From a paper:
The recently developed FRET-based calcium sensor Twitch-2B uses a minimal calcium-binding moiety derived from the C-terminal globular domain of toadfish Troponin C (TnC) fused between the mCerulean3 donor and a circular permutation of the yellow fluorescent protein Venus (cpVenuscd), which acts as the acceptor. Large-scale diversification and screening, predominantly of the residues linking the minimal calcium-binding domain and the fluorescent proteins, has been used to optimize FRET changes in this indicator.
The interfaces between the TnC domain and the donor and acceptor domains are dominated by polar interactions. We speculated that replacing those interactions by hydrophobic contacts would rigidify the linkers and increase the experimental FRET efficiency. In the crystal structure of this mutant (Twitch-6), the side chain of F532 indeed binds into a hydrophobic pocket formed by the side chains of F249, Asp262, and Y338. Otherwise, the structures of Twitch-6 and Twitch-2B are very similar (RMSD of 0.25 Å), resulting in nearly identical theoretical FRET efficiencies.
Residue numbers in the entry: 5 to 65, 69 to 370, 385 to 447, 451 to 555
The structure:
């Protein structure tokens, strides 16, 4: 292997595509600067209008221009295969839509680096997010997780790539990648690492054709525990250890490891657990966790990278004196979707929550009010660092499917904090408890007359929220009335400086009884993505 990438290199890109019978060609040109991990490319659809969104093609349309730091040069397969080049193949699975299969040759032709690609797409929905042009033209980013494939003399890569849908929600594209060298000469076969990639999409004002301008940065990295503080490694362990007992069990690992990506089978999970549990005692201690972080490269970058932790401490008490169910220990699995009503002019959040109860092995009263689609009202008054605001919401809850849908409006103008920081504050009564767990649903048992739900939320390296809510029925409407006080926030921090992404991760909320207050309590870590 040799470095023809020491300076600036001219790039050509040619793609021929067919997605659901819709043919198209793309031609691009630009420059690559590997020493700074930089590309600049202008891409043109030569066949008129592109039948798919430009952001779906970014990854298909030259990773040999990655910046490999000096301590990682021995892991750069891409450059080592030059000038003869490599074959890059992918299958890209769009969530709830079709897939692309791609085959590219990336090689030198003279002193120009050329990417020649054929792409075939199938099973797309003609008015899906892809063929219906429903994605935003923003920016994409992600980590490309590389492992050696010694059998083919090359590498594999996987990564989930997110792209914003026009309604503010997120489209997932699951990438499976292979690279093999075109020639016979030696190549570097790397230890597990990843490419940290940020893509900037824009337009030329002077270009009439359907096109994309791309500025892109690609940097090689490898997670090492030596490069994180005790604090950070402890935080990361605690994401896994969500029952707070100091050790990671199999159920926990299964739950949390699947938040690092969508591409692990039940067997892959069993394997990682077995490999990490080096003393075979059925649990991952902290020393074992530290090895597991280096061996399974996605863990720290996906759970902790670019994340703002919010530590929640919660307590729920019945308003009534009627008897309630106090549960054995268990947890709630939360998935959340954030979107925008395109006809609401005020600052607002549409929130969809999926919530199921789990974590009791296998071996009513105010249930009934939830049989039952139930209308919800939400009222919050807030004060964060002296900044007052009110939120008013309405929607529906469906406990039989663990589903709720809410539209929330800031009635005082512009919300002085990001909507995602209020998601947890703005209805655990709409969780679906399995039939073997119905005796553990405190939340429904307190209805009709309801419960108080208090929290303290600690934003790491920033201020905290304190909340008090009453959740009760008034007639046939379920009402959540909340006061929120926030203090000690930094005016240029991630909260008051609005540097949190408009999306939401999945979480497991461990619930325990609090018999002395005749209720339940819970503490859990929320993970807000930064930017
Ligand atoms: Ca544990
Ligand atoms: Ca162990």
């Amino acid at each position: 292997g040799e470095e023809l990438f020491t300076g600036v290199v001219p790039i050509l890109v040619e793609l021929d595509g067919d997605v659901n019978g819709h043919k198209f060609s793309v031609s691009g040109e630009g420059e690559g600067d590997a020493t700074y991990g930089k590309l600049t490319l202008k891409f043109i659809c030569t066949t008129g209008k592109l039948p798919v969104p430009w952001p779906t093609l970014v990854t298909t349309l030259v990773q040999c221009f990655a910046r490999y730091p000096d301590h990682m040069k021995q892991h750069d397969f891409f450059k080592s295969a030059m000038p003869e080049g490599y074959v890059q193949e992918r299958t890209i699975f769009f969530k709830d839509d079709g897939n692309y299969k791609t085959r590219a040759e990336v090689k030198f032709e003279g002193d120009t680096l050329v990417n020649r690609i054929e792409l075939k797409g199938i099973d797309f929905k003609e008015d899906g997010n892809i063929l219906g042009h429903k994605l935003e033209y923003n920016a994409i980013h992600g980590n490309v997780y590389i492992t050696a494939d010694k059998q083919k003399n090359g590498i594999k890569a996987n990564f989930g790539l997110n792209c914003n849908i026009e309604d503010g929600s997120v489209q997932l594209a699951d990438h499976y990648q292979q690279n093999t060298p075109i020639g016979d000469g030696p190549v570097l076969l790397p230890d597990n690492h990843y490419l940290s990639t940020q893509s900037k999409l824009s337009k030329d004002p002077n270009e009439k054709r359907d096109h994309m301008v791309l500025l892109e940065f690609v940097t090689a990295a490898r997670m090492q525990v030596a490069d994180a503080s005790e604090e950070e490694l402890s935080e990361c362990f605690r994401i896994f250890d969500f029952d707070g007992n100091g050790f990671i069990d199999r159920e926990e690992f299964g739950d949390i490891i699947r938040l690092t990506g969508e591409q692990l089978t039940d067997e892959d999970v069993d394997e990682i657990f077995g490999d990490s549990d080096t003393d075979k005692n059925g649990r991952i201690d902290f020393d074992e966790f530290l090895k597991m972080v280096e061996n399974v490269q996605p863990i720290y970058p996906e759970l902790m990278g670019g994340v703002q932790l919010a530590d929640h401490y919660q307590q729920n008490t019945p308003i009534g004196d009627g008897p309630v169910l106090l549960p054995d220990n268990h947890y709630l699995s939360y998935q959340s979707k954030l979107s925008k009503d395109p006809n609401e002019k005020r600052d607002h959040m549409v929130l969809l929550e999926f919530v199921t109860a789990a974590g009791i092995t296998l071996g009513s009263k105010g249930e009934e009010l939830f049989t039952g689609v139930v209308p919800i009202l939400v009222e919050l008054d807030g004060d964060v660092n002296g900044h007052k605001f009110s939120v008013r919401g309405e929607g529906e809850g469906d406990a039989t499917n663990g589903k709720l849908t809410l539209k929330l409006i800031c009635t005082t103008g512009k919300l002085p904090v990001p909507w995602p920081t209020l998601v947890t504050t703005l209805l655990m009564c709409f969780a679906r408890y399995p039939d073997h767990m119905k005796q553990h649903d405190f939340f429904k048992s307190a209805m009709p007359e309801g419960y108080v739900q208090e929290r303290t939320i600690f934003f790491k390296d920033d201020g905290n929220y304190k909340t008090r809510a009453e959740v009760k029925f008034e007639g046939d409407t379920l009402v959540n009335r909340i006061e929120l006080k926030g203090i000690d926030f930094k005016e240029d921090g991630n909260i008051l400086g609005h540097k949190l992404e408009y999306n939401y991760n999945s979480h497991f909320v461990y619930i325990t009884a609090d018999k002395q207050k005749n209720g339940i309590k819970a503490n859990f870590k929320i993970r807000h993505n930064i930017e």
